Ligand binder design. Sequence first.
Ligand SMILES: *C(=O)CCCCCCCCCCCCCCC
Ligand SMILES: [Zn+2]
Lengths: 274, 9
Amino acid sequence: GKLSLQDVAELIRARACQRVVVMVGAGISTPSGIPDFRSPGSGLYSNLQQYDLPYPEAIFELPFFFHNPKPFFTLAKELYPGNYKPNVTHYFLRLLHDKGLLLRLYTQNIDGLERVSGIPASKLVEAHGTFASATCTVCQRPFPGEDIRADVMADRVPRCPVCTGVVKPDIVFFGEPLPQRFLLHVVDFPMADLLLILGTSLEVEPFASLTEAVRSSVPRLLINRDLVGPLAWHPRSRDVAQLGDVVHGVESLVELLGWTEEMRDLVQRETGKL
Amino acid sequence: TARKSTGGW
Ligand SMILES: *C(=O)CCCCCCCCCCCCCCC
Ligand SMILES: [Zn+2]
């Protein structure tokens, strides 16, 4: 009686799963043209030239950021919410929100496309920060994220109006604590009757451990290229894995839910807005 | 004095 993708589709349409929680990673942002490292990017990818990183992850580590913050702000310019548009996976999650089936959407991404697609902030946990807010690394004064937008887009480091220190967008670097809003998972995952895992290799803690927090009878559906994380080495009898292309996998589920017609219309209504 | 981590650091 193991579950298939169609069975999960039947549980939503049957309304046996009404509290859907979703975990997303870079896999759902690749189709929108967003650059990734572990999988080269544009010419801006190898803009490391002139920048002597000890390793690519130093871009998200404070000690090197103090030394040279320009590598980060080069990436920030690229990923800044405005140059890229949501794809079908993002709109599949708003359509899930518009039907009142989404409890929370937990995201590792910082491209801000989750809110560009229409999901309100109250339904999002941006576990790895956001460009919506910023903080001076010297005097710790917070600022709204848009006070530094012009500086980043003009390739000039944003400076603090009070102490001239470097203003850093509230992006979680490695070795930094996650935002306390991440603690909503303590209540949200037990409350969930369905978990969706979209486009992530589950290599970033403590976000990856979230796959364990849903109760033992809750289906865990993985739409991903690879079988990763606990759904690989700690499986549960109610797990499902639609392995393959994330877009193709979401298209399949949408197809099995009979939402195709509504997805077409929603994507057309959202892309037409200027 | 840490938490966010990925395979490497
Ligand atoms: C926490 O993991 C925040 C991650 C945001 C990552 C966006 C990375 C884009 C890739 C360009 C080059 C950066 C080095 C790779 C780090 C994994
Ligand atoms: Zn300052």
